[PDB]
Write a protein that binds this DNA or RNA. Structure first.
Lengths: 35, 93, 174, 202, 103, 317
RNA sequence: UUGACAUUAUUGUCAGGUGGGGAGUAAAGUUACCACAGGGAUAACUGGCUUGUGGCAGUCAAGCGUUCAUAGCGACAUUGCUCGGCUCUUCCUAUCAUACCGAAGCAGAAUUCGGUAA
């Protein structure tokens, strides 16, 4: 059940984690640019 | 050296000096490379250009330094004569 | 601070019996300074008897280290042996290996022991038994699991391992 | 991790000649344009050796090594050893004499054979009794003439060309251990005019 | 794998990598003095870097000392109102030096 | 004229007026040519040869064979080796890592030279940050009895747990404490050692933060803190040693002179062993001090050390 | 386990410290520090490529900003410190020499820069 779920939603895991990382990049950079 | 100094390579006014050394590196070195080449040929291309411009400016600077008479090492008359005609401190600056 | 259980000592004494042989009887029976060992936050510490007896007043958060640290118990339930043990270990070594003065600093950066050093090692060494690395002055450098036996490691090409690095004294730069 | 490949052929010459550089305190180094002779004179001689280098090129100083960077044939640089090495006399005297090779080979070997006598006259002036004199010299027409004047001014003269040389180059490292240090030196002997006076026909 | 980005390494380099087994950082890519400008007074003071604090994009890079655009670094004020931290503005992989602005 | 020199310190060195004025009053222009002109030397390279693993006469050969210029300092101990010229790395030599010697300053020797550790006894501690001095505790000891190690910093214990195990002391209870509430923890009857929790902090060649960023507020609360630490040191025992790395009076010989009156059980014995100049009586409108003669002094220019003060105490009842 | 008190080493009390060792009302969180085995997702296509003048911050500042300089972008300058090599054929000019010119304190000679030029 675990590995089948990983093969079904592996793509979405990749792109979600990457875009969340870039969201965190812009979040930190805004937290510097405000000050 | 001895009594007189007419034999000095000319001094470019620092804007034209740039236009001599930088244009020579554009004309004398190869200038065309694809991005699709090997990384080794791309590296060697730009290395060859940085180095060649390096030798360019150095060659022109060495001509000035060796060309002009070493004021305090020539002769007491000439050391002082150049000191009278030109601000000796600024000549050494 | 706490006292070890029956199994927890056996796990330590076996790992110490990997490098020291059956000469582990030197380590616990002294009668003058019997040298009991305790652990704080899952990491064993080797000390004199009374120096741990009077330090039972220190708080667990307030405590940092106690004498000579051997190593820590892993989350899985094994026992690691840290480099700080060597001051106790090399005094009672069984299988001992030396190195080149030239090929010393490669070892001191984390690399393994190559065959490129030939001389007088210990004899009767099994393939996977714990060896202790010495460097003139017999300076202890660290631990090691042997790569081959003494017999096999003599007829070898000089770029093959003779002792896998485990911990070296270069860890004192961190 | 040395400076040049010329470094690996004196540490090789010491082992063959009883580690003479190990016992030696003060060293006069000649013609060392890289420091491939003073580095190995630092790792062999005892601490605070005080070794002095002379070379025609002006270049950097090295830690624990004093080095004067000017002419070899003048009297003023001889007054720079007279400026320093009058109180102490050198235990050894090194010679990595080499010209800018690539002109006929006849002269590329004879300006070498000329240079070694001028290095000899800086050596015969400033060497301790029963020291040594190690020399790079090319095999040539006038090599047999140099080994003879070595033979009558030193105790034991032994040529080598050790391993870790080029094997194709016509180098010889000849050592001259034991120094006479005479009170009466022959003046017509040491001058290069009489040294290369050619042998008469048969 | 080797890093082809410009980094700063602290002076305890000799046996520092506990957790950096084969992370090669060549000596050519190590820039020690950031070309820092002062905001409130338009003067640029070329000062040595003390500590790499917070590199965005990667928290690996914070532990490696990578100096990509947006990295907050610590500046030595030995030469000397001043702010101890500076944020980098250039991409030192492309141009020569590291250019930072104080906070 | 004084203000000329005060303009030739605060501009020439780039220095604080608060410290330049407070370290020139009742000090000669000769002494101004001693202290102020010595902050370019920056700690001469001495070494502490660990007597446990090797004797010094067997360690002189070890570094010289690798081409290190070595010479002992004056009279104190053969342990201190002055390094002049070395190319072999000055911290990465296998003998550093072995624990044959630790790299120290010359000022790091003497607060434990003054202290005299004996066999089987316990030594207590409050603030030993690197652990270079606790080495000299547990080497004269020859690994017997108890040795406490302490500092009030969780980050700086890593230097202690590095150096203790590096040099092999075996008898170390290195534990983080608050130094004030220390007699309530245990209060061991045998001797203690305290050193430099200081705001005056001498020799600016080490830390140039002193050069710019020392105001009066540091001199208010830090001398008060180290004052209370004496009141915990005299409540441990038995030969107390309290020292600091500061030439300013508000750190030594005003802090020690408080605790002298505050308990009648306090005696100041002859502190150092070899040399070190005589101590003053008057400290710019301060009390009578014929008892405070023995607390030694050291200067950065009279000798090649880093200016500091030692005060060794004795307790009776 | 430390101090105080008494017994005047031994023993008691009190007070101070530790104390999932026992009595009463174990193991778990985390991981881009991450090291090894497994599953995913693609990497590496001139979309006229390439050349001589850096980057960061500020100073100006043609205008445009949805009106418009106070929603902001902003060129040239400027100011801050700092795999190698042997041999031949053909082609390109971004030409080292030969040919002709222009500028240059170019007296003559020699030269420097530049133009046409394969």
């Amino acid at each position: 059940r675990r590995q089948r779920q990983l093969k079904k939603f592996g793509k979405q895991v990749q792109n979600a984690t990457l875009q969340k990382r870039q969201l965190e990049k812009r979040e930190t950079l805004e937290k510097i640019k405000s000050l | 050296m001895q009594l007189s100094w007419k034999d000095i390579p000319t001094v470019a006014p620092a804007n034209d000096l740039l236009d001599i050394v930088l244009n020579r590196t554009q004309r004398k070195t190869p200038t065309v490379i694809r991005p699709g080449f090997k990384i080794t040929r791309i590296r060697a291309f730009y290395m060859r250009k940085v180095k060649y411009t390096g030798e360019g400016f150095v060659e022109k600077f060495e001509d000035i330094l060796k060309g002009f008479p070493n004021i305090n090492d020539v002769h007491p008359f000439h050391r002082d004569l150049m000191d009278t005609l030109y601000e000796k401190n600024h000549y050494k600056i | 601070m706490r006292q070890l259980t029956e199994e927890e000592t056996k796990v330590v004494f076996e790992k110490l019996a990997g490098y020291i042989g059956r000469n582990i009887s030197f380590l616990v029976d002294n009668k003058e300074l019997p040298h009991v060992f305790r652990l704080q936050k899952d990491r064993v510490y080797y000390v004199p008897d009374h120096v741990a007896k009077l330090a039972t007043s220190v708080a667990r958060p307030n405590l940092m280290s106690l004498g000579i640290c051997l190593g820590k118990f892993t989350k899985t339930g094994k026992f690691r042996l840290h480099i700080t043990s060597l001051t106790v270990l090399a005094k009672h070594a069984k299988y001992k290996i030396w190195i080149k003065p030239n090929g010393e600093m490669p070892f001191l950066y984390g690399n393994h022991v190559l065959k490129a050093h030939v001389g007088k090692m210990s004899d009767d060494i099994p393939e996977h038994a714990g060896v202790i690395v010495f460097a003139m002055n017999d300076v202890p450098l660290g631990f090691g699991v042997s790569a081959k036996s003494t017999s096999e490691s003599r007829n070898m090409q000089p770029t093959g391992i003779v002792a896998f690095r485990q911990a070296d004294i270069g860890e004192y730069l961190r | 991790g040395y400076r040049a490949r010329s470094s690996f052929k004196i540490i090789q010459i010491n082992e063959k000649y009883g580690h003479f550089l190990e016992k030696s305190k003060v060293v006069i180094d000649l013609c060392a344009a890289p420091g491939s002779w003073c580095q190995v004179a630092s790792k062999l001689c005892p601490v605070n050796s005080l070794i002095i280098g002379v070379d025609i090129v002006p270049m950097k100083p090295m830690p624990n090594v004093i080095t004067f960077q000017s002419d070899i044939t003048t009297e003023d640089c001889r007054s720079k050893l007279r400026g320093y090495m009058k109180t102490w006399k050198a235990d050894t005297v090194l010679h990595d004499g080499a010209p800018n090779v690539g002109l006929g080979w006849v002269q590329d070997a004879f300006t070498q054979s000329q240079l070694t006598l001028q290095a000899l006259k800086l050596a015969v002036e400033n060497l301790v009794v029963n020291g040594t004199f190690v020399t790079k010299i090319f095999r040539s027409k006038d090599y047999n003439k140099l080994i003879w004047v070595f033979q009558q001014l030193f105790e034991k003269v032994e040529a080598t060309k050790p391993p870790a040389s080029r094997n194709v180059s016509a180098e010889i490292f000849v050592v001259c251990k034991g120094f006479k240090a005479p009170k009466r030196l022959d003046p017509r002997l040491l001058d290069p005019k009489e040294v290369f006076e050619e042998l008469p026909d048969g | 794998r080797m890093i082809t980005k410009h980094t700063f390494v602290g002076e305890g380099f000799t046996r520092r990598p506990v957790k950096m087994e084969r992370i090669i950082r060549p000596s050519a890519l190590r820039q020690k003095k950031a070309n820092v400008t002062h905001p409130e007074l338009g003067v640029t003071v070329f000062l040595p870097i003390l500590a790499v604090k917070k590199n965005p994009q990667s928290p690996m890079y914070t532990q490696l000392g990578v100096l990509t655009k947006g990295t907050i670094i610590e500046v030595n004020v030995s030469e000397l109102v001043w702010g101890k931290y500076a944020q980098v503005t250039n991409e030192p992989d492309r141009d020569g030096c590291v250019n930072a602005v104080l906070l | 004229y004084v203000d000329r020199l005060l303009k030739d310190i605060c501009e020439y060195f780039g220095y604080t007026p608060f410290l330049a004025e407070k370290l020139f009053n009742l000090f000669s222009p000769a002494e101004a040519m001693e202290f102020f002109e010595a902050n370019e030397i920056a700690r001469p390279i001495t070494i502490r040869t660990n007597t446990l693993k090797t004797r010094r006469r067997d360690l002189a050969q070890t570094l010289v064979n690798r081409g290190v210029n070595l010479q002992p300092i004056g009279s104190w101990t053969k342990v201190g080796l002055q390094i002049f010229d070395s190319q072999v790395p000055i911290g990465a030599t296998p003998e550093y890592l072995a624990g044959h010697y630790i790299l120290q300053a010359a000022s790091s020797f003497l607060p434990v030279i003054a202290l005299d550790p004996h066999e089987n006894e316990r030594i207590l501690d409050m603030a030993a940050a690197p652990g270079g001095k606790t080495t000299y505790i547990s080497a004269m000891m020859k690994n017997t009895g108890c040795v406490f190690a302490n500092d009030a910093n969780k980050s700086r214990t890593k230097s202690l747990i590095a150096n203790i195990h590096r040099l092999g002391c075996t008898n170390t209870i290195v534990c983080n404490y608050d130094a004030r509430e220390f007699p309530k923890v245990i209060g061991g009857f045998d001797r203690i050692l305290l050193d430099a929790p200081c705001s005056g902090t001498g020799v600016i060649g080490k830390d140039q933060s002193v050069k710019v960023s020392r105001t009066e507020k540091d001199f208010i609360q830090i001398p008060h803190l180290q004052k209370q630490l004496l009141l915990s040191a005299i409540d441990s025992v038995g030969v107390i040693v309290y020292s600091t790395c500061s030439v300013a009076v508000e750190e030594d010989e005003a802090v020690i002179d408080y605790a002298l009156r505050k308990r009648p059980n306090v005696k100041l014995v002859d502190t150092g062993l070899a040399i070190g100049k005589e101590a003053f009586t008057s400290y710019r409108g301060k009390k009578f001090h014929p008892s405070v003669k023995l607390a030694r002094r050291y200067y950065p220019h009279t000798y090649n050390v880093d200016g500091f003060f030692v005060a060794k105490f004795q307790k009776i009842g």
